[PDB]
Every structure is written in C-alpha cells, then in structure tokens.
C-alpha cells in the first residue's frame, strides 16, 4: 500500500505498509517520514472523515481508513517531545 501521506512540506509517499499494519507501525513511520508524533497527528481520509479516535495500538490499517495510495492528512499539532533534529 503506497499510501500518500498528506503533511507539512506536501504529500509523502509511504510505501511498506500492508493490510495488516498495525497503529504503532503506521503512525511510527510517518513519526519517521514527516516527523509528525503519533499526538500531533490524526487519522484523516480525503473523503470525509468522522474524526475516528484510535483507542488501540495492535489495530491494523484493515480496521482503519486507510486504503492503497489513499489521502492521509497527517496534521502537525506543533505540541511533540522535540529533544532531537532527527
């Protein structure tokens, strides 16, 4: 699933996520792409979106929205644990 990512700087094509990927997996990626924290960031489709709360970990993108090359809008809240530049 060649997901885009839609975040600060514009699109970011996050490739290695299968079906099964979990919230931890998804999330930790784009923490490592956009650098965007698993806090700063929410689970929004370009299709409208009802602002689904993740109340899990293990949850895999099958559960979740997220669909092959689909437009994840990954938000930057600013407010994230910023002790490093990478």
């Known amino acids: 699933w060649r ?3 839609k ?4 699109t970011h ?3 290695g996520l299968s079906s099964r990927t979990r919230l931890r ?8 792409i956009t ?11 370009g299709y409208p979106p009802e ?10 993108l099958g559960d979740l929205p997220i669909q092959s090359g689909d437009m ?7 407010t994230r644990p910023k002790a490093s530049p990478s």
């Open 3 to 5: 997901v885009r990512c």
């Open 35 to 45: 650098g965007i924290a698993p806090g700063s960031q929410r689970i929004l489709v």
């Open 51 to 60: 602002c689904l709360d993740l109340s899990d970990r293990d949850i895999t």
């Open 25 to 32: 997996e998804l999330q930790g990626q784009i923490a490592a």
């Open 72 to 78: 994840l809008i990954v938000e930057e809240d600013q």
């Open 7 to 10: 975040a600060k700087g514009g």
């Open 13 to 15: 094509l996050l490739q």
